[PDB]
Amino acid sequence: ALTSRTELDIDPDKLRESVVELLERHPLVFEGTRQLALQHRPEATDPWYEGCQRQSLISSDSDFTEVHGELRDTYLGEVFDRLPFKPIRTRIMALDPKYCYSVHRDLTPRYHLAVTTSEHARFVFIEHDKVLHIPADGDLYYVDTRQLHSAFNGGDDMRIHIVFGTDG
Amino acid sequence: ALTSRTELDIDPDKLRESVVELLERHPLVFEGTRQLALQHRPEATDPWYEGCQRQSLISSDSDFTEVHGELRDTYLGEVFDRLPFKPIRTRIMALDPKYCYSVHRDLTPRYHLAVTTSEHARFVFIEHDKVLHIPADGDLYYVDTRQLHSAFNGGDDMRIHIVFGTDG
Numbered sequence: 608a609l610t611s612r613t614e615l616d617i618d619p620d621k622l623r624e625s626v627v628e629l630l631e632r633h634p635l636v637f638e639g640t641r642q643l644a645l646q647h648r649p650e651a652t653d654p655w656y657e658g659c660q661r662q663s664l665i666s667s668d669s670d671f672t673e674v675h676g677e678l679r680d681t682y683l684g685e686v687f688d689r690l691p692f693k694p695i696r697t698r699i700m701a702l703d704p705k706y707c708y709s710v711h712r713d714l715t716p717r718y719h720l721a722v723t724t725s726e727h728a729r730f731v732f733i734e735h736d737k738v739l740h741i742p743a744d745g746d747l748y749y750v751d752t753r754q755l756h757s758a759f760n761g762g763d764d765m766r767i768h769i770v771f772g773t774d775g
Numbered sequence: 776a777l778t779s780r781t782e783l784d785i786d787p788d789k790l791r792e793s794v795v796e797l798l799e800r801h802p803l804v805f806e807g808t809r810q811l812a813l814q815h816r817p818e819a820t821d822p823w824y825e826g827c828q829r830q831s832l833i834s835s836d837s838d839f840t841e842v843h844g845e846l847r848d849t850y851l852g853e854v855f856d857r858l859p860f861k862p863i864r865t866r867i868m869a870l871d872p873k874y875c876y877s878v879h880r881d882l883t884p885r886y887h888l889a890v891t892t893s894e895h896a897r898f899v900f901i902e903h904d905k906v907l908h909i910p911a912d913g914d915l916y917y918v919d920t921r922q923l924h925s926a927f928n929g930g931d932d933m934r935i936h937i938v939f940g941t942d943g
């Protein structure tokens with residue numbers, strides 16, 4: 608319901624290595640929550656960043672279906688192959704040190720795969736009085752972000768997740 | 776135990792006005808968590824900021840007993856008069872927009888009086904799975920910060936509390 612953990616058996620070190628090499632070639636945009644789109648709409652002219660725009664500017668998360676071709680022969684492409692669901696509008700989502708989100712609701716739930724994190728990173732459900740830490744254990748963590756929530760990174764380094772949108 | 780709320784019946788508007796005028800004359804130091812000491816040690820040479828130093832540099836919170844003389848004929852002095860306990864090392868503690876603390880423990884518990892806040896500010900107890908919002912209702916909120924905790928401000932404006940240390 609609120610959360611779930613699905614066994615993916617991703618190796619966290621190889622995932623970390625692959626994300627770091629990718630960000631070297633396609634850097635994150637924005638400052639507090641830094642982002643990089645891993646899926647794009649068909650015929651997107653700005654595929655790496657269109658998906659990172661504010662929700663009031665997003666046609667529909669469902670249009671963001673295309674995994675970038677340059678990922679397919681990387682470890683990230685293998686991650687996509689292992690997903691038990693059809694992802695939409697997947698993004699790298701990075702929290703700067705000491706950064707947090709507003710308390711908000713999203714339109715759909717989402718899956719997280721933690722890339723780099725610490726004990727100082729938590730996801731908080733406001734109305735259900737639940738605090739969750741998403742570990743970089745190579746498994747996939749569902750969070751029903753339609754519920755009122757925030758997330759924060761009280762650590763000294765960036766907290767990097769891959770966040771997959773979902774339909775069904 | 777973990778928390779309590781004590782009726783002080785402080786007027787939130789007058790508290791806000793008084794804190795704003797004080798910060799005009801004695802500004803907050805630091806950037807992410809901005810602070811101002813309202814108590815000082817006897818014979819302190821830097822009374823407004825000595826109490827804001829890192830805990831590994833603090834002799835003992837118990838030495839910070841002197842409320843600044845210039846507060847006594849302000850509304851803040853009246854707040855001190857209404858406290859049911861003997862405060863030590865009281866500070867204004869301000870969270871910048873989108874800022875959060877590390878997940879940590881303090882040596883003693885503390886009382887909060889919220890000055891300006893929003894729905895995006897929360898205090899989180901990590902091991903007890905409890906999320907708390909401290910409202911600017913003019914009442915005093917005890918938090919046992921010896922327990923593992925953080926606090927965050929996901930709002931667009933600064934979240935300002937007065938935080939009173941305690942012995943007994």
Ligand SMILES: O=C(O)CCC(=O)C(=O)O
Binds near residue numbers: 770
């Ligand atoms: O953890 C993140 O970076 C995003 C948290 C959030 O607001 C979400 O997943 O909807």
Ligand SMILES: O=C(O)CCC(=O)C(=O)O
Binds near residue numbers: 869870876920925926
């Ligand atoms: O809310 C604040 O600014 C301080 C939170 C904290 O870490 C404490 O009260 O010990």
Ligand SMILES: [Fe+3]
Binds near residue numbers: 712
């Ligand atoms: Fe969200």
Ligand SMILES: [Fe+3]
Binds near residue numbers: 739742
């Ligand atoms: Fe987390």
Ligand SMILES: [Fe+3]
Binds near residue numbers: 881
């Ligand atoms: Fe603390």
Ligand SMILES: [Fe+3]
Binds near residue numbers: 897909
């Ligand atoms: Fe709060």
Ligand SMILES: [K+]
Binds near residue numbers: 612
């Ligand atoms: K588990």
Ligand SMILES: [K+]
Binds near residue numbers: 780
């Ligand atoms: K109450």
